[PDB]
């Protein structure tokens, strides 16, 4: 089975040969597509192929399958496997999975960059206290002044389930989110339960509409405990706009480094439960979602108003207008002030070189449109135009219900 | 079995279960998803038609009368006899209506049942052909207050005998290859305009001339017509603040017009079936004026309004993308030629969606086509979870009759 994908706009055709190494399941049958559906304990039974799988591809990466080294491998971790019903990865192999982990990331327009990841292994962790040093010195690390680099830090794997490390904040780094009695938002309103959550546990809310969340730390399937992140580790960056004066006035800001903290990272079978993971921000993620969401921070009408817009008919594009605006105010105001960010087009673009590389050398790039097309100015991107295949690679990231859900509280 | 799909943005939930009378095959499987993939006999028909009836019977709170019952068995008789079958004049209405309801990939739909069909099942020739586009085209257009219509052709026979429109919409401009390497008028009807050259078209070589028509009747050589010039709307394009934008020489045509796929309605099948609406400002505004392998106007245009084109992150491009987009309704607008704004239409599609669940338990849609193409997330489209299906009667896309054709 081969598979060809084409570009509308310059004929280039590609094929697809990696699918067909493709383990797990999209979602999607022969008679229904759930393309842009958001979401569609292990035994020894079933660890050990997991283990090969992935021990295989390791061995090949490093150009030294069926080794000696590959088969003594292999053999002692199904030993260790059937004396202890897990296995330990080697550091070598740790950093491998996080990478391609990356690398397989369907959803994920800035794959380029995905062989320049800082691994940071925390399994050698214990407490909260123990995770929330850890995070401090990934979030000083990334940040690096305002020139960011990507890394992950990644604590101990699940065992009995019962025994999870958890980040319970969806990013290391989000603002409060306060709901008013006459139902009105203060802050971002994405973070209104989580604020809450916090709040119970003892945070003292300043109740602000930038407050930086305190980090909420579960280490060993312990209760989370709190932690405040020093301030001067969190860079962030006042909204301006080069052209209209008025838009500091807004009173917006936002932070330089974005760090996904809730997802799981599969490798080789082991699941790693806490493995925050950060990069540098594409602008419309704050200036088009985080700002202009109708659920989010809203303030498409507040601009629109002080550009004196013609807010009577939808037909003069004013929320179009006002959110260009927003968007070079973004970009301009980080560039400024030399904090790493990308637009939309150069991000594109790269990701079009990056996936046709991928095809040549890889035999494909599993890519998900819905995701990497921006969510502004879709087709004068290079994205729009090209066709992509969807499927799932392990090692891997995955979504994981929200540990407030699922943690037994011991108290 | 039941399936529920979630908008992001009000929490509104909504099951499906209409995706259990999908026939047709999606492109994807259980280990790979094809969605942003463009294009992914007696004992035949049979079941086909009776699907088709059935569904129809219902739909008049008639299913297992005798008037079924009875409809059933002539069809039965007449493929028996003749290998395929005429549709009553109700069901090729009901067949046409439903293949708009079920196109998975429009954001139009709420105007569904409100289609105009014209039978032109009776026609035998290209120059009567000519005569039913031309009332369609004058019937729909209606002086700027568009009517949504089709056009209904003889269906196949043995395949050696199709109608076919050879253009891809009924009204579109000329493209030509220049010596200076560069295209004059739409690159994308090049090789379509090389063949009306190729059958004789006498080409003005300007950069919006209206193709005209190549018709295909009864299976023989295509032939050529101009439509009456007084018959095609078009629409000068001007800014509400720019004055310098009506000097780039721009206009486009009010009646947007498929004329290239096939209908389909119980295993019968219209290879020529020319329908049209009107259009979504951002088809032409984005699309037609904006894509790089299209007019490729965003170049002139921030040239014109002084932008910072020395980086990508002055967002120029973006800049400019919205003006000609406010052009582009401004001037419909002004001249009342019906279009609709990304906005609105998206907005109507939400609560035709809605409609649809509550009345039908579904509605088939395809999230990367019906997203505009310019401010995704703004639109209440971008966070409404889609499921895709396929549903008939449909319309499906054929090969270009150039590239299948014995001369
Ligand atoms: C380095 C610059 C990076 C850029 C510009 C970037 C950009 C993006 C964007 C725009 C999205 C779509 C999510 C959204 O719009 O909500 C995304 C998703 C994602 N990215 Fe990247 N990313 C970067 C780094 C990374 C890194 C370092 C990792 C892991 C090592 C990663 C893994 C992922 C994953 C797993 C998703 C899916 C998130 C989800 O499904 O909710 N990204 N990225
Ligand atoms: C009344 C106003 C209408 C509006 C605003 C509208 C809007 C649209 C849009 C924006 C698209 C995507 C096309 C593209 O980007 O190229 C589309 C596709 C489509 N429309 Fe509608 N439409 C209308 C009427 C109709 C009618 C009357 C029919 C049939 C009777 C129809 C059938 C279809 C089909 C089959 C497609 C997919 C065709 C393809 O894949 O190119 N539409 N429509
Ligand atoms: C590392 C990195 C760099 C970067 N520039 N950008 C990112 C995107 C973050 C991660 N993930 C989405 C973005 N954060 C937004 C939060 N949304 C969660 C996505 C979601 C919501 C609901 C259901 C569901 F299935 C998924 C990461
Ligand atoms: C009836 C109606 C009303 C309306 N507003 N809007 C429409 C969409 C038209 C028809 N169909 C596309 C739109 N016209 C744009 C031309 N693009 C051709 C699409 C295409 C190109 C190449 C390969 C492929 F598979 C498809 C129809
Ligand atoms: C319903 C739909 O799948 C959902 O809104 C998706 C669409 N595309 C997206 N793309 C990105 N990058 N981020 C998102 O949150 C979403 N949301
Ligand atoms: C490759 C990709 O599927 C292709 O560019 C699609 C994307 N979405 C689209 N959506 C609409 N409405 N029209 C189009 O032509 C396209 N093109
Ligand atoms: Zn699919």
Redesign the interface.
């Given at each position: 089975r081969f598979?060809k994908?084409?570009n509308?706009?310059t004929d280039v055709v590609l094929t697809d040969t990696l699918?067909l190494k493709?383990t797990l399941?999209?979602?999607?049958?022969?008679?229904?597509?759930?393309?842009?559906?958001?979401l569609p304990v292990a035994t020894k039974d079933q660890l050990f192929p997991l283990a090969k799988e992935f021990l295989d591809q390791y061995y090949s990466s490093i150009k030294r399958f069926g080794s000696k080294a590959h088969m003594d491998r292999l053999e002692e971790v199904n030993k260790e496997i059937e004396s202890t019903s897990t296995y330990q990865l080697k550091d070598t192999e740790l950093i491998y999975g996080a990478k391609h982990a990356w690398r397989n990331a369907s959803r994920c327009v800035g794959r380029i960059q995905w062989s320049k990841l800082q691994v940071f292994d925390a399994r050698d962790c214990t407490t909260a206290h123990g995770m929330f040093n850890y995070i401090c010195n990934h979030v000083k690390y990334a940040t690096n002044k305002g020139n960011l680099r990507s890394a992950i830090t990644i604590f101990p794997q699940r065992t009995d389930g019962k025994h999870d490390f958890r980040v319970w904040n969806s990013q290391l780094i989000r603002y409060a989110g306060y709901k008013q009695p006459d139902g009105s938002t203060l802050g971002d309103p994405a973070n209104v339960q989580f604020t809450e959550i916090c709040i119970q546990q003892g945070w003292k809310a300043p109740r602000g509409r930038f407050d930086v969340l305190p980090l909420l730390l579960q280490a060993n399937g312990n209760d989370p405990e709190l932690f405040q992140i020093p301030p001067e580790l969190v860079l962030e960056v006042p909204i301006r706009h080069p052209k209209f004066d008025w838009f500091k006035d807004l009173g917006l800001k936002w932070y330089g480094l974005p760090a996904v903290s809730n997802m799981l990272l599969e490798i080789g079978g082991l699941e790693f439960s806490a493995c925050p993971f950060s990069g540098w921000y594409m602008?419309t993620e704050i200036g088009?979602?985080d700002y202009?969401?109708?659920?989010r921070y809203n303030i498409?009408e507040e601009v629109a108003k002080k550009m004196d817009l013609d807010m009577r008919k939808?037909?003069?594009?004013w929320?179009?207008?006002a959110?260009?605006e927003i968007?070079?105010a973004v970009?301009?105001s980080f560039?400024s002030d030399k904090v790493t960010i990308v637009?939309h087009?150069?991000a594109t673009e790269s990701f079009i070189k990056h996936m046709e590389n991928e095809y040549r050398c890889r035999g494909g790039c599993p890519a998900?449109?819905?995701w990497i097309?921006?969510?502004?100015?879709?087709?004068?991107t290079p994205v729009?135009?090209?066709?992509?295949?969807?499927?799932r690679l392990t090692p891997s990231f995955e979504y994981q219900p929200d540990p407030w859900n699922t943690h037994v509280w011991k108290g």
């Open positions: 598979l994908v084409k509308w706009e699918h493709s399941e999209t979602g999607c049958t022969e008679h229904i597509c759930m393309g842009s559906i958001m602008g088009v979602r202009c969401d109708n659920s498409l939808t037909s003069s594009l929320k179009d207008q959110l260009v968007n070079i970009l301009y560039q637009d087009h150069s998900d449109w819905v097309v921006p969510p502004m100015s879709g087709s004068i729009f135009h090209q066709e992509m295949l969807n499927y």
